Amino acid sequence: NIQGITKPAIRRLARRGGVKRISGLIYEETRGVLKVFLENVIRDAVTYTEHAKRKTVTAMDVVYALKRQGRTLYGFG
Amino acid sequence: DNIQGITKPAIRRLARRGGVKRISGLIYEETRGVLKVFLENVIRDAVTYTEHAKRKTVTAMDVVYALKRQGRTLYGFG
């Protein structure tokens, strides 16, 4: 499942980040930190959705969660 | 100069609290530089609060507000 995100995607990301050369040990650690980041945001998004009594999460819940984390995403209204 | 009042020994003592085992001689200027910038960041904020307060002394409170704006909350002075 986290195996669905797979090496070429990580490579492409790192290339946008200018990583010229990339050791084989990095893919598991990047999966790790990605899982942590997702958990840390989903926790709050789900919490907002629960408090709204809804069963549907919304982009507003996500951007609220991110703003609470302290990085702000424009363009989703 | 007033910035030279931050002595090399004191900077070394701070580095020792930082656990620094060994210090290259250039760091004393870098530490002064960043410190001056750090002051130059917070102080203009604090005096701006005083100007809004229209008072002429600063107070511990308004500098605490400046640190709060800096995202660097300091307890104990209130």
Place this chain on the structure above:
Amino acid sequence: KESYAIYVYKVLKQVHPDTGISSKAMSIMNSFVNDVFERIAGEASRLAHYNKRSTITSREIQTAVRLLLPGELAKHAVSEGTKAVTKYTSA
């Protein structure tokens, strides 16, 4: 010119009556409690505004605690709050 000092002494005497506390440490506590109060109230306000609701009630602070606190701290704090409001409303 209100401050929390006496309440701090009450909780102190409950947890550890054996020991005093420095006025500096008291001023630290008075800063901390005000900071966390401002934080949680700010979050509760953000919640109520987001829901377009007019009012703050227990459910808002209950959610904001689950947002601001670490999970285990939230788990205990929300329980204590539930107990407190249960007693208050029963009484």
Place this chain on the structure above:
Amino acid sequence: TRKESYAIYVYKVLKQVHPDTGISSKAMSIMNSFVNDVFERIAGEASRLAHYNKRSTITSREIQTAVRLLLPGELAKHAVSEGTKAVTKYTS
């Protein structure tokens, strides 16, 4: 049911700065987000100032100082010039 946004004002000011160009709806949404963010930031800071001085009210002086704090120096200088001339026109 109805929407609310700054989009028409963004478009108007764009035409004033540049009469030829236009923008994607994505860009318009991003602009509306930016405007909402900066509005919330300045209002929050102004309310902090208000409470710090036990004031009941938000006025020109409050916003002028909250913006002087939020903006970097050259932006703040221009913003305060814009606000000053705007207020003086409005009262005139």
Place this chain on the structure above:
Amino acid sequence: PTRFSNRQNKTVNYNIDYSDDDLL
């Protein structure tokens, strides 16, 4: 004593007395 935490924190040492006879 009246209040006790539920939280299963580990035991902690807070003593910060130390010597220098390892350095001599």
Place this chain on the structure above:
Amino acid sequence: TRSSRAGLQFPVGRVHRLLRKGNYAERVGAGAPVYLAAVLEYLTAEILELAGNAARDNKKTRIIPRHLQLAVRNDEELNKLLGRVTIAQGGVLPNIQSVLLP
């Protein structure tokens, strides 16, 4: 119309209503909303100016988020104001650490 009296393009009414409904204070002085509208229209004018120039350099007439990310990061004051903002499809500035070059 208050915006016309001020000579501003932004909605003095809408912002005053938002200051009321946002409950930032129990009182709002009449100067506050016009000053806020002025600073908002100034900031937006600046960012639209830079985005327009970026679009012209790319020889495209409709501005798109790439142009916004370019404009906002190519000015150090905008970047400082917006250091922790991110924007959809705002692909980062092209750069390479010269050590990486042959």
Place this chain on the structure above:
Amino acid sequence: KTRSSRAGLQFPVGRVHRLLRKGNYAERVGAGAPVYLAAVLEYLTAEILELAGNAARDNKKTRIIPRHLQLAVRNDEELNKLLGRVTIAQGGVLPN
């Protein structure tokens, strides 16, 4: 008599309710909010006072001082996270 006693709490339900009404956090507040907030504040203060108590106790010190507060709050990784940005005046570093 006071609502704190009705809740079984030490913290000043009156003062906190007044502050909530004063602070323009909302136009309205329910009676449960202030007592719940007092409850959680009293819990967190009890926790930190406990830890500082231990930080004094093994230093053989009869009386809490800021150094003990820092020693406590930086040892608990959860409270450290909660105070991650906080600076404690006269709080030295942890030994390492």
Place this chain on the structure above:
Amino acid sequence: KPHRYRPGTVALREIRRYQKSTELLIRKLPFQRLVREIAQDFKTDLRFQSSAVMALQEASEAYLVALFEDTNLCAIHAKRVTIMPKDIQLARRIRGE
């Protein structure tokens, strides 16, 4: 002859290409599959606005590329071009996480 490029030339072309690009660099279905299996650990049966999934996709992509851009400096500081897990561990520790 195969006209094989020597190592790194292709990598530098990739870097230039993907810094020119803005599109999302990661497959949609795998991501929106994963995220709901994460959500399942908090609460079952959540429905999602697709726009919410796109917001998460964008935020996570930006966060990852920012962390890579930071760790590149760390690898430069070790005066080696290959990044290593200890590098991103350091970068995270310095950022504070």
Place this chain on the structure above:
Amino acid sequence: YRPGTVALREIRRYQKSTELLIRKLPFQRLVREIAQDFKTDLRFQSSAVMALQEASEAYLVALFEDTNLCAIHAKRVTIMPKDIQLARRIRGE
């Protein structure tokens, strides 16, 4: 004492200690010098100068503690200016 142990000793000492390291008057003269740039008509509460030195020392110590990690990751032990520049660039300032 064995060679070089003084560094370890004074590290352990100043980690144990809590007091301010900087001289009070020099720091006050410094912050007054910085301030008078913004407005000549000025006064300070002494507690404000205390808060300033406290915050600045805490910030410096934190920056040192990070840059030490940078140095050891480079497998040096001597701290170097490029370490400071890196650590600041990672944190953002």
